[PDB]
Amino acid sequence: TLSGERREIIRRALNKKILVPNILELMPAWPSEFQPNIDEVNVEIDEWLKTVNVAKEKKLKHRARGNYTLLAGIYYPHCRKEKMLALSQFLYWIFFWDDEIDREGTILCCAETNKCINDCLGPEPNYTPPPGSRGTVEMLYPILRDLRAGLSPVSTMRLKQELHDYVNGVKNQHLPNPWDHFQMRVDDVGVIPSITQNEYAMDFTLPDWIRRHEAMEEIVLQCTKLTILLNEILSLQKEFRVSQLENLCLLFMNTYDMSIEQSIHKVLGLLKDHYKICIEAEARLPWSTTDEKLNNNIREYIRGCQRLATGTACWSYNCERYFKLSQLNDQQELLLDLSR
Numbered sequence: 123t124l125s126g127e128r129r130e131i132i133r134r135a136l137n138k139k140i141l142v143p144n145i146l147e148l149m150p151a152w153p154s155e156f157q158p159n160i161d162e163v164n165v166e167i168d169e170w171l172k173t174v175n176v177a178k179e180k181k182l183k184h185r186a187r188g189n190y191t192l193l194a195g196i197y198y199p200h201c202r203k204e205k206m207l208a209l210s211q212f213l214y215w216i217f218f219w220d221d222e223i224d225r226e227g228t229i230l231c232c233a234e235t236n237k238c239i240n241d242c243l244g245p246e247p248n249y250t251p252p253p254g255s256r257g258t259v260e261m262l263y264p265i266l267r268d269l270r271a272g273l274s275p276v277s278t279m280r281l282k283q284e285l286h287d288y289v290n291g292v293k294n295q296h297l298p299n300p301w302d303h304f305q306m307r308v309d310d311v312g313v314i315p316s317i318t319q320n321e322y323a324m325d326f327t328l329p330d331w332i333r334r335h336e337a338m339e340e341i342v343l344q345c346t347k348l349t350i351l352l353n354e355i356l357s358l359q360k361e362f363r364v365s366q367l368e369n370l371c372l373l374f375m376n377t378y379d380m381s382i383e384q385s386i387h388k389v390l391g392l393l394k395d396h397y398k399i400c401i402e403a404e405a406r407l408p409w410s411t412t413d414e415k416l417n418n419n420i421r422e423y424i425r426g427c428q429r430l431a432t433g434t435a436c437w438s439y440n441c442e443r444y445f446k447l448s449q450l451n452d453q454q455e456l457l458l459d460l461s462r
């Protein structure tokens with residue numbers, strides 16, 4: 123039965139301590155940087171959060187442990203400070219929304235959220251939340267409006283589809299097979315809208331014909347996979363402690379009777395594989411022989427993709443969403459601790 127499988131995983135992983143190498147070292151060509159106005163933007167974010175209709179203690183737990191302005195600051199380290207506000211607000215939205223979301227309640231929330239996405243990003247814009255909107259939907263209307271104000275319709279269409287994909291993936295969601303779990307996250311994970319928001323952050327539009335080029339599709343895919351893989355390792359302690367066993371490390375343990383150490387090693391191996399694929403795709407991009415602006419846009423778009431992966435790791439090593447920062451030693455090696 124499913125309960126026997128879950129119970130045995132818990133039995134095998136309980137109280138295990140695993141030292142994880144610094145994941146940033148597995149992506150050595152891709153540097154991590156910090157937007158220089160994070161503190162100033164956080165002051166704005168704190169004033170804004172007072173107006174958000176999410177419980178005070180919940181907003182504060184996210185602000186304290188997640189501190190998503192820092193995440194935006196690492197995703198978008200070269201944007202101007204004026205862009206940082208909407209970018210930080212969006213991350214507060216998606217984490218609040220994911221937190222707050224009972225099959226009926228989920229279906230209703232997803233429908234109201236998809237409606238907001240259509241209202242704000244679709245061909246007949248309406249930025250006014252319907253009366254009686256829940257807090258995590260009401261707050262999304264002005265965020266999408268502000269993002270759309272700094273986006274071409276080309277980029278807006280991609281953001282719209284990507285947000286629908288995220289919301290519908292949440293709606294749709296034996297222990298599962300590890301590869302089924304991985305592929306589901308590759309389709310469903312909320313990271314692609316962050317790649318598109320680099321176009322907002324750096325005020326440019328990547329043309330569709332380049333976005334659809336096999337090598338650019340590959341880079342987006344590889345960076346999505348890399349972000350998932352490192353998140354599986356970095357979130358293992360958090361998820362195991364609330365008995366959320368659908369973590370890739372535990373699924374490798376279950377399906378293949380791997381030890382927890384072997385399974386983490388396997389995920390780290392996949393990270394290195396997909397990084398090398400990603401790097402090799404750059405040579406195949408349709409770089410222009412003449413157009414500096416176009417090539418700067420291609421460069422910025424792929425740096426945005428790479429920063430999703432390095433930035434999610436770097437942020438995880440600089441906040442307390444996933445573990446206590448005392449669990450890092452002086453080499454940024456993480457001592458996971460699956461105690462309860």
Ligand SMILES: C/C=C(\C)CC/C=C(\C)CCC=C(C)C
Nearest residue numbers: 216217220312313349350353434
């Ligand atoms: C799966 C979580 C991560 C890869 C961390 C970075 C992800 C985002 C910034 C958007 C996803 C938001 C969620 C609440 C899952």
Ligand SMILES: [Mg+2]
Nearest residue numbers: 353354357361
């Ligand atoms: Mg996770």
